[PDB]
Amino acid sequence: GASKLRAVLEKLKLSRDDISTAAGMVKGVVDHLLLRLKCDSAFRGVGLLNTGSYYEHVKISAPNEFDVMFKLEVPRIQLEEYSNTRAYYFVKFKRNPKENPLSQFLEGEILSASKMLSKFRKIIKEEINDIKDTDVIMKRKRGGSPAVTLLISEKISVDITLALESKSSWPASTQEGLRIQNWLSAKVRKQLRLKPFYLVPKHAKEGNGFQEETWRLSFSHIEKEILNNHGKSKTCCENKEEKCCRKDCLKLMKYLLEQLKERFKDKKHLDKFSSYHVKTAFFHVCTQNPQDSQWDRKDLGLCFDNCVTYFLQCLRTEKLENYFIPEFNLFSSNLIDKRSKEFLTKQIEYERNNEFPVFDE
Numbered sequence: 001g002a003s004k005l006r007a008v009l010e011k012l013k014l015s016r017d018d019i020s021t022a023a024g025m026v027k028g029v030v031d032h033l034l035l036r037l038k039c040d041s042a043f044r045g046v047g048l049l050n051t052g053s054y055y056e057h058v059k060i061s062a063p064n065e066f067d068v069m070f071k072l073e074v075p076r077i078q079l080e081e082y083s084n085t086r087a088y089y090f091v092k093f094k095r096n097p098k099e100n101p102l103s104q105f106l107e108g109e110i111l112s113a114s115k116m117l118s119k120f121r122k123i124i125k126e127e128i129n130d131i132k133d134t135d136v137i138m139k140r141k142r143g144g145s146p147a148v149t150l151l152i153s154e155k156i157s158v159d160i161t162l163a164l165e166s167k168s169s170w171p172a173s174t175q176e177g178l179r180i181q182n183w184l185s186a187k188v189r190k191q192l193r194l195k196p197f198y199l200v201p202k203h204a205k206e207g208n209g210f211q212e213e214t215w216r217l218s219f220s221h222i223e224k225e226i227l228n229n230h231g232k233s234k235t236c237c238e239n240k241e242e243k244c245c246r247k248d249c250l251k252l253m254k255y256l257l258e259q260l261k262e263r264f265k266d267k268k269h270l271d272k273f274s275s276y277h278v279k280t281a282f283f284h285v286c287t288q289n290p291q292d293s294q295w296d297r298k299d300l301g302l303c304f305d306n307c308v309t310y311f312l313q314c315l316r317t318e319k320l321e322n323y324f325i326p327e328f329n330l331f332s333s334n335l336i337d338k339r340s341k342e343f344l345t346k347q348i349e350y351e352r353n354n355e356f357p358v359f360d361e
């Protein structure tokens with residue numbers, strides 16, 4: 001229970017404090033790459049997404065695996081939804097009397113993620129080789145991923161993702177999403193929806209089996225802003241008497257899935273689940289339990305159980321709405337077959353019934 005879950009959280013804290021030297025190395029490589037990329041005519045306006053914060057850790061049990069997002073603003077973007085999939089869009093340009101450098105990535109009237117990533121990757125590979133103050137290598141592209149992956153010092157890996165930034169209003173598919181009014185208030189929802197949105201290249205293994213040049217909506221800056229300002233109280237987690245366990249529960253949900261994917265990495269059944277699914281379910285639980293008193297630190301075990309049982313319910317009913325785009329069902333059988341969700345249900349039920357053996361040291 002709570003005492004065991006606390007021990008888990010404490011062990012993961014230890015490894016995070018150690019990797020600050022690794023973060024220093026990552027930041028040094030990323031800053032060199034941005035300086036070089038900004039010299040290119042097509043990537044002139046590239047920059048860090050979450051400029052203050054280099055890097056996230058997608059995988060909490062892999063402290064030496066870093067994730068960084070670059071953003072590239074494209075003004076006057078014209079988006080064309082793909083086959084009413086709600087999440088995937090062709091990117092087109094508006095009126096064309098002025099041509100600009102990004103047109104070198106056009107395929108017809110459509111902005112090609114392939115072409116853009118090819119030049120992106122080529123510049124990084126060149127510049128990585130021209131670095132000599134630290135040993136960094138570029139890893140070969142895996143069949144699906146659009147990310148550029150660097151390996152630093154034999155054990156630090158960095159996934160770099162290039163996102164397009166649009167400063168216009170969010171696409172209409174988001175209009176009924178981000179249902180935070182009863183938790184964080186309607187005016188915070190309005191404020192958040194005034195920020196830009198992002199488009200990222202999709203995986204090859206992602207989508208309808210074609211290699212169409214569609215882009216996927218991305219709201220990772222919104223996820224980050226909410227987690228850093230997450231209470232109903234404006235002073236949640238800013239004093240002794242207002243320490244909640246929201247972030248802890250999310251960490252534990254991520255770690256649960258990571259451990260189970262590892263325990264079963266021989267089989268194929270868990271390959272389609274990722275932190276994305278656990279994060280989505282967590283945010284729904286925050287919507288469902290908006291009071292800070294529902295997240296008291298003393299109740300860590302009960303709050304974590306709440307997150308687990310909600311996730312189990314989503315698996316069993318095969319319904320998990322995207323937090324921003326409610327019509328997109330992460331758990332549709334078009335995306336994950338029923339037997340895979342049934343298998344994960346079985347494993348999470350086993351863990352819950354046995355006080356989570358997959359956690360203990």
Ligand SMILES: CCCc1cc(=O)n2nc(NCc3cc(-c4ccncc4)ccc3Cl)nc2[nH]1
Nearest residue numbers: 087217218219220223276279280322323325328
């Ligand atoms: C705060 C809740 C978690 C969250 C963070 C975030 O950054 N985003 N970004 C979107 N964009 C919409 C979208 C994304 C994907 C997707 C497919 C594959 N790998 C990732 C994402 C599939 C369908 C849809 Cl509709 N959703 C989210 N949720």
Ligand SMILES: [Zn+2]
Nearest residue numbers: 231236237244
């Ligand atoms: Zn808090």
